[PDB]
Amino acid sequence: ARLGRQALLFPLCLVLYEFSTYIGNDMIQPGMLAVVEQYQAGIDWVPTSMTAYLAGGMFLQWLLGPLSDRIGRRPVMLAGVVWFIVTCLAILLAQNIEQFTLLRFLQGISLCFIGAVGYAAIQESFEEAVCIKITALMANVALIAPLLGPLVGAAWIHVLPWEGMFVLFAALAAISFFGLQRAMPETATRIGEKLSLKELGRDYKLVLKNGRFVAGALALGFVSLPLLAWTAQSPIIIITGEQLSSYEYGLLQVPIFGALIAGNLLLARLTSRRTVRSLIIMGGWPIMIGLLVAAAATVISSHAYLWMTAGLSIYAFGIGLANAGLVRLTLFASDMSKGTVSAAMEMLQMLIFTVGIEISKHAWLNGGNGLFNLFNLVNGILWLSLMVIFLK
Ligand SMILES: CCCCCCCCCCCC[N+](C)(C)[O-]
Ligand SMILES: CCCCCCCCCCCC[N+](C)(C)[O-]
Ligand SMILES: [Pr+3]
Ligand SMILES: [Pr+3]
């Protein structure tokens, strides 16, 4: 007795899995101060938790897409959910911060299953119209998690051990596993076919030769890096840096990620009467001004964290308005397999995130908020520079 009611259970559980992998990063960052204290490791390992998680997030997309096409979307997706559960529980037995960070990398591999197999099964399963609605819900979850995560995460370590968070991630994932086991269809259309790694290597070499595709893909990385660098480092900037509490830390997340949502909501309204190109130029203004204000203010006054938050909120508003559009143009900048293009642009932007967060970390360690913000400004200029070519 399962076909109508169990039709929308499949996207629902994939959304739940997407949610748990995202708070798997976003809840952990505030709780990371407790982790650092419990291992007696330096504060420099706080953003490295995210770096490793995102490094794992770019490790397998290239393989998982065409592999799940040959052996099945079901077994590969269920293997990803299981892997997440297992590595979530496995981090409880970590004996030092290096082992913690290593399992943080292994946990992040679970991200690769969302786009390359999960969402591919969505495209293959539903009509164009219904697929749009699921994609919309997936985008909403991506907006809520970086806001709810630091808030719940900061409140969590006030009462419960950080170990408990990973039990929560695995429990949520276990719910999604049983749901995906029952409701996910098999939609792989190349089952039985052999997979050629040499032939797959030729495909990725081909998209990287597309100059216009790479410019847009790097631009998505550079432009979102400030936001990710804030996510990675706000616990150490606010609590250990500014000598503030969890309350301030969490409160400052609201205007920033709230502006992100506001910029996406305005994007939804203006989408019928604006081209993707003009929305990028539209968002370009608050992106540049926001980053400029954050930089200038913390250079003249190192502890002007409210001005920093204000600048990042203005910038975040610009990202909400301009990001989805640039994703769209980058996807269509290469006339090649969507799975390959998606994986390539996911891989490229997460290379910039991982490298950039680590540079960002050293920037703040050596020069405080001024240098943290100046590096963010450079990333904006790099996005802006790529846009003058990508658009003109
Ligand atoms: C508009 C933001 C672009 C970031 C790309 C999304 C990467 C998902 C990785 C999960 C980490 C969550 N986070 C920090 C991005 O909110
Ligand atoms: C936030 C949900 C993600 C799954 C569906 C939307 C992604 C389709 C395009 C893939 C490339 C986009 N990006 C930002 C990951 O590079
Ligand atoms: Pr070929
Ligand atoms: Pr091919």
Author numbering: 9 to 400
Give the original sentences from the paper that presented this experimental model.
A principal mechanism underpinning the unabated multidrug resistance is mediated by integral membrane proteins known as multidrug transporters. The majority of the known multidrug transporters utilize the inwardly directed H+ electrochemical gradient to expel drugs through cellular membranes. In sharp contrast to MdfA, which cannot extrude short dicationic compounds such as the neurotoxicant methyl viologen (MV), I239T/G354E can export both monocationic and short dicationic drugs, besides other well-known MdfA substrates. To answer these questions, we report the crystal structures of I239T/G354E in complexes with LDAO, MV and DXC, determined at resolutions up to 2.2 Å.
The best diffracting crystals of I239T/G354E were obtained in the presence of LDAO at pH 8. The resulting structure was determined to 2.2 Å resolution by combining molecular replacement and single wavelength anomalous dispersion (SAD) phasing. Overall, the LDAO-bound structure of I239T/G354E is similar to that of Q131R, which could be superimposed onto each other to yield a rms deviation of 1.0 Å for 390 common Cα atoms. Perhaps unexpectedly, the density-modified SAD maps revealed two continuous, unbranched non-protein electron density features within I239T/G354E, indicating two bound LDAO molecules, denoted LDAO1 and LDAO2. LDAO1, similar to that seen in the LDAO-bound Q131R structure, is seated halfway into the lipid bilayer, at roughly equal distance between the extracellular and intracellular surfaces of the membrane. LDAO2, by contrast, is situated between LDAO1 and the cytoplasm-membrane interface, ~6 Å from the latter and appreciably more solvent-accessible than LDAO1. The closest approach of LDAO1 and LDAO2 exceeds 5 Å, implying that they interact with the transporter independently. Apparently, the addition of the side chain carboxylate of G354E, rather than substantial protein structural change, enables I239T/G354E to interact with a second LDAO molecule.
